[PDB]
Write a protein that binds this DNA or RNA. Structure first.
Ligand SMILES: [Mg+2]
Ligand SMILES: [Mg+2]
Ligand SMILES: [Mg+2]
Ligand SMILES: [Mg+2]
Ligand SMILES: [Mg+2]
Ligand SMILES: [Mg+2]
Ligand SMILES: [Mg+2]
Ligand SMILES: [Mg+2]
Ligand SMILES: [Mg+2]
Ligand SMILES: [Mg+2]
Ligand SMILES: [Mg+2]
Ligand SMILES: [Mg+2]
Ligand SMILES: [Mg+2]
Ligand SMILES: [Mg+2]
Ligand SMILES: [Mg+2]
Ligand SMILES: [Mg+2]
Ligand SMILES: [Mg+2]
Ligand SMILES: [Mg+2]
Ligand SMILES: [Mg+2]
Ligand SMILES: [Mg+2]
Ligand SMILES: [Mg+2]
Ligand SMILES: [Mg+2]
Ligand SMILES: [Mg+2]
Ligand SMILES: [Mg+2]
Ligand SMILES: [Mg+2]
Ligand SMILES: [Mg+2]
Ligand SMILES: [Mg+2]
Ligand SMILES: [Mg+2]
Ligand SMILES: [Mg+2]
Ligand SMILES: [Mg+2]
Ligand SMILES: [Mg+2]
Ligand SMILES: [Mg+2]
Ligand SMILES: [Mg+2]
Ligand SMILES: [Mg+2]
Ligand SMILES: [Mg+2]
Ligand SMILES: [Mg+2]
Ligand SMILES: [Mg+2]
Ligand SMILES: [Mg+2]
Ligand SMILES: [Mg+2]
Ligand SMILES: [Mg+2]
Ligand SMILES: [Mg+2]
Ligand SMILES: [Mg+2]
Ligand SMILES: [Mg+2]
Ligand SMILES: [Mg+2]
Ligand SMILES: [Mg+2]
Ligand SMILES: [Mg+2]
Ligand SMILES: [Mg+2]
Ligand SMILES: [Mg+2]
Ligand SMILES: [Mg+2]
Ligand SMILES: [Mg+2]
Ligand SMILES: [Mg+2]
Ligand SMILES: [Mg+2]
Ligand SMILES: [Mg+2]
Ligand SMILES: [Mg+2]
Ligand SMILES: [Mg+2]
Ligand SMILES: [Mg+2]
Ligand SMILES: [Mg+2]
Ligand SMILES: [Zn+2]
Lengths: 81, 87, 144, 155, 129, 150
RNA sequence: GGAUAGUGGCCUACCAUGGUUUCAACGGGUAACGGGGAAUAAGGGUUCGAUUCCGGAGAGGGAGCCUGAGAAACGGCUACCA
RNA sequence: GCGGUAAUUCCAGCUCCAAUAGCGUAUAUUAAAGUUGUUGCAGUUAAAAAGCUCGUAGUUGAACUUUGGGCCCGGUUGGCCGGUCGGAUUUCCAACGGGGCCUUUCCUUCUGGCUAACCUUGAGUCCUUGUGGCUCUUGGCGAACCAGGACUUUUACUUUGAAAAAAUUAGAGUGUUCAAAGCAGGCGUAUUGCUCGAAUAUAUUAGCAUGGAAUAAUAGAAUAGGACG
RNA sequence: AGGGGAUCGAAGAUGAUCAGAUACCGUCGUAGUCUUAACCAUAAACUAUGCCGACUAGGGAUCGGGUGGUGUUUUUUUAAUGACCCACUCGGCACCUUACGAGAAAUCAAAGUCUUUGGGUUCUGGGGGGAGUAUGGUCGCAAGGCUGAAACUUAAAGGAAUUG
């Protein structure tokens, strides 16, 4: 206030702002590999789904969509990248 | 505000806020001058020796006189930490 | 930027808009409609000479109480009938019916002057010899 | 405009004073005359290869182009061998210090050496009174059609 | 919808100065904004500014001091005719001794005294004192 | 902010700075293009295909891994539909609104929503028609639009 | 094609269906001849120009024409109207 | 607003004020008027946002495409000296503008005519120890524009310039005795003539003509019917 | 034009009241009030406040969406759920305090960033009456709607606040 660093804002009070009102806008969503031990290989999923994503082979499930992030189904794991 | 040949004409070069650099004019009986005493070895505040700061009425009314004092004095060596430039 | 189109090629809209709103100016409207020539007992002219029909005693308005000595006059270029004041103490003695008087405006753009209700004119000359000269007595009315 | 027939009038359509002697056997039947208008306006091949007559042609006719040279955009191509072009321009009004879009429609004769369509931009040369209203003649087509075939069907 | 990007940056600069600030994030920046801010800085009414590159249209962080009373944009880029640079500066400049009217000419975005020495003219962009 | 209401809500995708990468993304241009075309064969829309590719596969943006917008990929391999898809879904809607209004002539609200939709149709169509993707003289009309969409 | 000193629907014959218009056509008003100009002095404007110079039009109102290089003339003729 | 009995507004006398060979009146118009508002108005309650939404004409409309650096050429003010018999120019110097270059960089383009300019050099030298300086023809500049052929995306803006009646306006000169004016007049050997003038400015919108390439539009290559050869 | 017509109830009739009382109050109660098919297009149709865009200041509530949690309560075997709590951020309906700033003031986060006068655009007003009258055009079955003057008259009409 009165004088402040607009070019180097603290990543704390930048983390709080709106995805469009940041210094250079970018997403707040992420991808993740998901597994269901019946299979040995993994599927790449977006955090906000819309489409209820099904695995490679087994007609299983993975996630049912919502107003935002997807809800991964029961017994599943996920590393993020 | 000189004149034709040299000669500084026109009286009264007014003060100036150290926070905004807007003029401090006469009828502003709400601006302020803060004398900050230069100390020396082991306490001892040296009477008749100050680092001074002028603050305009606008800033004090706006509530920015504390925060702007911190910034002004700290980047003048009589404070460390306290103030952050980012936020 | 309230109202007016600010842009660089809207000179048409600005001109027209001015044209339209000039009409709300009472004297532009008068000048363009030709009211001068159409209404108004004079022709638009500065003066007009007429004939004295009868001598009237108009009672003044409030809060004044007088009798305002006027003349009904019929304009020679119009036949229009017009009630006109005879100014100064006396002077109504100077007129008489059927005489030929030079009426002028009252200096109020139309509009009646003071307390004389609905008199928008005044007598300047009778019989070609001007009230003022007669009142002071520099002149004397013609023979008949 | 024209097209077809050539000889489609009660009068014989001929170029004046361009004799083709019948004794002299020729392999081109009719002898044709042409020129160039000047100001660097190429007399297009459709005027020299053509067979039409148009005495109001600036290249194959009896009219000289001189004076103004203007351009407009073709808005009417319904009169036989003549068009009407629009000439927009901004007029400066001082009092308000801005402009206002104006326009005028010039009637202009068009030789059948040009295939003109509404929308094309055309360059037009002044010439002697051709008709009651026509004081200009098309001397260059600076357009084409405006990507007409690029509106074709699906894949 | 956004109608003059020059206007937004300028006004924003003005609300900053009046609110007693020293910095200001303007959006969305353009060549014309850069060159206005460059003539403003060429005469010290602002300090140094900084173009941050979002992969869109841009952002500018202007560092400003406080010798700026007002910097305005003349919204219809009126055409000025070498004689009329006189009447413009007369209209909106506090004095003959100082202040600049900046405009666009075919010899570049430049203040009126520059445009006078260079002896060119064109359209009027804005002003700053 | 919003043309046919007074709502002002900001809401969109926030596109990333990184115009290339994900680096962690293996595959190839070859791969996803063939994925695009196989789904286009399935009858999906470029919107539908982008979403499906963005969650079920790893396609952050189809335009980054292949320097080509999905609609151009569909166009090149000769899959572009007759009209664009935003104009389609608008017309499709107007069709359903109208059908509902043929059934319920007492729903004045639907009439008002039909005007708005149709006006949006006509302005969009006018844009497309300016930029030559719709044949100059292409016009929407209720009698032929029901037949159009289906 | 005729007519003109000559271009031109200027006019006639045949043929076509064109021309102008909210960027205001067409019509109505003007106590309207147009310009150089005049009055009003921060500027931007507002108002005015029958009238010493330039252009146009008329010679009570219309039309017609003789003479002639030049007039549709009026301090020319011819006819009608007043 | 004055006048109904001590009228500062009437009718007069006195005195006094303002303008003065002039002063009052009426009508119009201009200023005052930011009460027509482009500059430059106002519209919650004073005059004034259409009950509401669509919407054509109209006006308006996000950002982005040669930016940056290097070298040369010559101007016009200003300083510190003046060398000089008030003005003079070279070097020392900044300041502010103009032109052309090289950086991947059409300048419309061929085919000669023409060359002013150096990558030249052919000699060496006037002269400060030498790149301070130009005459000077024998390998090596295009564009400075002639003229012929072949073609060219369209505009707006601005600059300068031509074409530009007089009187009017602005304005220089000139002592109509002053002045409004007028364009005269001024010098001697005033016996046999000598001579300065009769400027300059504005003159816009449109059309013409040249320079600019920011700001605004416009056209281009996507069913390649694209570009060069 | 059909239906419907319980309720209340312009009209009308009455009882009282009053000097009068065509009212106010009481009673009866026609039309209407309800619905269908058509008309009509006006309300203080009000926030008496055009729309789109930018910027300028603190605060606690609240509605919808979302994110974050080894938060609470719900028991079962931990969860999952659901409701609840805290932090955040969008878009809402609002209030609070401020007032840098605006106004003639009442007041106003716009009615602000306006003589230091220019983001884009639409509409309206130019002293009071005369008068939303006259006239024409147009729309309607009608009642009426839209468009809409002038002659004349007049020095105030008006706004907000203060004191009585
Ligand atoms: Mg009115
Ligand atoms: Mg009145
Ligand atoms: Mg009488
Ligand atoms: Mg022909
Ligand atoms: Mg025809
Ligand atoms: Mg023709
Ligand atoms: Mg928004
Ligand atoms: Mg809209
Ligand atoms: Mg959304
Ligand atoms: Mg002829
Ligand atoms: Mg017809
Ligand atoms: Mg027609
Ligand atoms: Mg009109
Ligand atoms: Mg007349
Ligand atoms: Mg006139
Ligand atoms: Mg005249
Ligand atoms: Mg006359
Ligand atoms: Mg002539
Ligand atoms: Mg006579
Ligand atoms: Mg005659
Ligand atoms: Mg004569
Ligand atoms: Mg007669
Ligand atoms: Mg007395
Ligand atoms: Mg008096
Ligand atoms: Mg007296
Ligand atoms: Mg006087
Ligand atoms: Mg003034
Ligand atoms: Mg007024
Ligand atoms: Mg202006
Ligand atoms: Mg001003
Ligand atoms: Mg006002
Ligand atoms: Mg009101
Ligand atoms: Mg409203
Ligand atoms: Mg309407
Ligand atoms: Mg732009
Ligand atoms: Mg450079
Ligand atoms: Mg240079
Ligand atoms: Mg010029
Ligand atoms: Mg009932
Ligand atoms: Mg009753
Ligand atoms: Mg009774
Ligand atoms: Mg009754
Ligand atoms: Mg009762
Ligand atoms: Mg109403
Ligand atoms: Mg209310
Ligand atoms: Mg209202
Ligand atoms: Mg707040
Ligand atoms: Mg949660
Ligand atoms: Mg405030
Ligand atoms: Mg207060
Ligand atoms: Mg009024
Ligand atoms: Mg009627
Ligand atoms: Mg009926
Ligand atoms: Mg009626
Ligand atoms: Mg009305
Ligand atoms: Mg009526
Ligand atoms: Mg009174
Ligand atoms: Zn699986």
């Amino acid at each position: 206030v009165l004088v402040q660093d607009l070019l180097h804002p603290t990543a704390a009070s930048e983390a709080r702002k709106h995805k469009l009102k940041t210094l250079v806008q970018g997403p707040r969503s992420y991808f993740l590999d998901v597994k269901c031990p019946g299979c040995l290989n993994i599927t790449t999923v977006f955090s906000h789904a819309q489409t209820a994503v099904t695995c490679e082979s087994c007609s299983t499930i993975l996630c049912t969509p919502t107003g935002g992030k997807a809800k991964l189904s029961e017994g599943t794991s996920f590393r993020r990248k | 505000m000189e004149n034709d040949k040299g000669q500084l004409v026109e009286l009264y070069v007014p003060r100036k806020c150290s926070a905004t650099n807007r003029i401090i004019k006469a009828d502003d009986h709400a601006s302020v001058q803060i004398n900050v005493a230069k100390v020396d070895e082991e306490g001892r505040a040296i009477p008749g020796e100050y680092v001074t700061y002028a603050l305009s009425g606008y800033v004090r009314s706006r509530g920015e006189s504390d925060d702007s004092l911190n910034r002004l004095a700290q980047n003048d060596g009589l404070l460390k930490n306290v103030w952050s430039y980012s936020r | 930027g309230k109202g007016k189109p600010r842009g660089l090629n809207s000179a048409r809209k600005l001109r027209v808009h001015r044209r339209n709103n000039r009409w709300a100016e009472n004297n532009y409207k008068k000048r363009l409609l030709g009211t001068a020539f159409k209404s108004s007992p004079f022709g638009g002219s500065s003066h007009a000479k007429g004939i004295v029909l009868e001598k009237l005693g108009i009672e003044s308005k409030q809060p004044n109480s007088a009798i305002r000595k006027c003349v009904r006059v019929q304009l020679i270029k119009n036949g229009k009938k017009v009630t006109a004041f005879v100014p100064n103490d006396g002077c109504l003695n100077f007129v008489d019916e059927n005489d030929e008087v030079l009426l002028a405006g009252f200096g109020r753009k139309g509009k009646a002057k003071g307390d004389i209700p609905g008199v928008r004119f005044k007598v300047v000359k009778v019989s070609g010899v001007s009230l003022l000269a007669l009142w002071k007595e520099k002149k004397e009315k013609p023979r008949s | 405009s024209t097209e077809l027939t050539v000889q489609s009038e009660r009068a014989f359509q001929k170029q004046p004073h361009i004799f083709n002697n019948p004794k002299v056997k020729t392999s081109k039947r009719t002898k044709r005359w042409y020129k160039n208008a000047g100001l660097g306006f190429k007399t297009p091949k459709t005027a020299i290869e053509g067979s039409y007559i148009d005495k109001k042609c600036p290249f194959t006719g009896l009219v000289s182009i001189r004076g103004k040279i203007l351009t407009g955009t073709v808005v009417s191509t319904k009169m036989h061998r003549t068009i009407v072009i629009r000439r927009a321009y901004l007029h400066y009004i001082p009092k308000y210090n801005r402009y206002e879009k104006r326009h005028k429609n010039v009637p202009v004769h068009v030789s059948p050496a040009f295939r003109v369509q509404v929308g094309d931009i055309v360059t037009v040369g002044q010439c002697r009174p051709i008709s009651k209203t026509v004081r200009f003649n098309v001397v260059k087509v600076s357009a084409a059609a405006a990507x007409x075939x690029x509106x074709x069907x699906x894949x | 919808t956004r109608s003059s990007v020059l206007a937004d940056a300028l006004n924003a600069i003005n609300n900053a100065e009046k609110t007693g600030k020293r910095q200001v994030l303007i959006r969305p920046s353009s060549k014309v904004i850069i060159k206005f801010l460059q003539v403003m800085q060429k005469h010290g009414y602002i300090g140094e500014f900084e173009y941050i590159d979002d992969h869109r249209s841009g952002k500018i962080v202007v560092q400003l001091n406080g010798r700026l009373n007002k910097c305005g944009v003349i919204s219809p880029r009126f055409n000025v005719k070498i004689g009329d640079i006189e009447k413009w500066t007369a209209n909106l400049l506090p004095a003959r001794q100082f202040g600049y009217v900046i405009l666009t000419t075919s010899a570049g975005i430049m203040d009126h005294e520059e445009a006078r020495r260079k002896h060119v003219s064109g359209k009027i962009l804005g002003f700053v004192y | 902010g919003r043309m046919h209401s007074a709502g002002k809500g900001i809401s969109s995708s926030a596109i990333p700075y990184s115009r290339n990468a994900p680096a962690w993304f293996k595959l190839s241009s070859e791969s996803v293009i063939e994925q695009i075309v196989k789904y286009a064969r399935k009858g999906l829309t470029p919107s539908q295909i982008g979403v499906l590719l963005r969650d079920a596969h790893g396609v952050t943006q189809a335009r980054v891994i292949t320097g080509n917008k999905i609609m151009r990929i569909l166009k090149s391999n000769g899959l572009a539909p007759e009209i664009p898809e935003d104009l389609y879904y608008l017309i499709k809607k107007a069709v359903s609104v109208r059908k509902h209004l043929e059934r319920n002539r007492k729903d004045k609200d639907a009439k008002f929503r039909l005007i708005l939709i149709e006006s949006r149709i006509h302005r969009l169509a006018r844009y497309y028609r300016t930029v030559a993707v719709l044949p100059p003289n292409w016009k929407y009309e209720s009698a032929t639009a029901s037949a159009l969409v289906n």
